[PDB]
Amino acid sequence: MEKLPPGWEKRMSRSSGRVYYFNHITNASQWERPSGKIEEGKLVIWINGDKGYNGLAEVGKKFEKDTGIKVTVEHPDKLEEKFPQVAATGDGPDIIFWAHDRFGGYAQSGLLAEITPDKAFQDKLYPFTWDAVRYNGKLIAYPIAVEALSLIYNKDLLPNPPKTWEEIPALDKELKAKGKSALMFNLQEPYFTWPLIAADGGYAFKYENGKYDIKDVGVDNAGAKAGLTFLVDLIKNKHMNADTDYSIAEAAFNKGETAMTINGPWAWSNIDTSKVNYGVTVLPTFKGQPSKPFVGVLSAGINAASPNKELAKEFLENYLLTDEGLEAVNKDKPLGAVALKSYEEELAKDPRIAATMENAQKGEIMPNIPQMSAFWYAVRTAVINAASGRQTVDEALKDAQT
Ligand SMILES: OC[C@H]1O[C@H](O[C@H]2[C@H](O)[C@@H](O)[C@@H](O)O[C@@H]2CO)[C@H](O)[C@@H](O)[C@@H]1O
């Protein structure tokens, strides 16, 4: 019989003589034993579909060829919503891949095991990536790659990309004279509009530690209002459409219909085959200030209820987080600037990667506070409601902030 995951208490129902389980962290109650659900002797991995999951699977076969231990890569939709649901019952994948921002929430709920890399392995990764996966003093995941949004532009349509958001409206005008658009990017996910929204740090940026104040002052401030108003105004003046998602933006750029998009390194792959001559460069400034994308560190956390933690450790440390492991993933979909020093040193020669790190260091590594999931949803609603005209910018942001 396996040991119980953190927070779990085993109990007896006096009325039926039936054992049940109660979790003091999540208040979850159930008849099935939380441990013992995840199958032992194999590795099941969840990663997002836009990532190099097929490349990750190659590392999985390499692991199986060497060890006999099967590795299974799955990419469900909304895995960031599904993992906490199942793992809170003791079920789910052994390893979950996602940006670090959601791991703090997972960690507080007792869903992620503390990882145990020794000092020698820690030296192999940049310390700032270990910081992204530290929750309440504990390392709760293996950092993989640094994800910063960059301005991606068509070199043929636009040899000299705009340095400011402000000059885009007029640029869109003279590109419409060509039957083109200046800029199209996913307006449905707050991840993509945030760099503009946070740009102006006049009201909510903390110079004490270089962090945007999302919990005290919050998104209801004049700086965020200016950013979202500029966004809405591009839409009213018809330089952007409120309905543009990832799919639409991607297609239009890779068909050369628009001069610019905003996206991460995972997107480079599809552009490469489209053979648009593209550049990856710094995001435009707004109000004299650099855009501040929330930077994600794609991380691999281990399920607290998993019986394969040492399997997971071996796989992540000695197969994935190597030069040949990351390359296998990187060739499938570009990871961005990796956490592994030795591999990143080769990638840093790539100007696209230099551009990624440049936007990263102008932006901010996301907080991993438990509230991140609520924050993202609040901002998303505000943007969507402001952009559709359903609310004004003040109202949208007032309601967003609580
Ligand atoms: O839009 C909110 C969303 O932003 C981030 O998600 C990114 C993710 O980090 C990237 O790896 C890529 O998959 O695009 C996502 C945006 O669609 C946050 O990590 C996520 O928690 C948040 O919901």
Residue numbers in the entry: 1 to 402
Relevant lines from the article:
In order to reveal the atomic-level details of co-translational folding, we determined the structures of a series of nascent model peptide with increasing amino acid length. For this study, we chose the human Pin1 Trp-Trp domain (WW domain), which consists of 35 residues, as our model peptide. The topology of the WW domain composed of three strands and two beta-hairpins, which form an antiparallel beta-sheet. The structures of the intermediate-length (WW11-MBP, WW17-MBP, WW19-MBP) and full-length (WW35-MBP) WW domains, which are fused with MBP at their C-termini, were determined with X-ray crystallography.
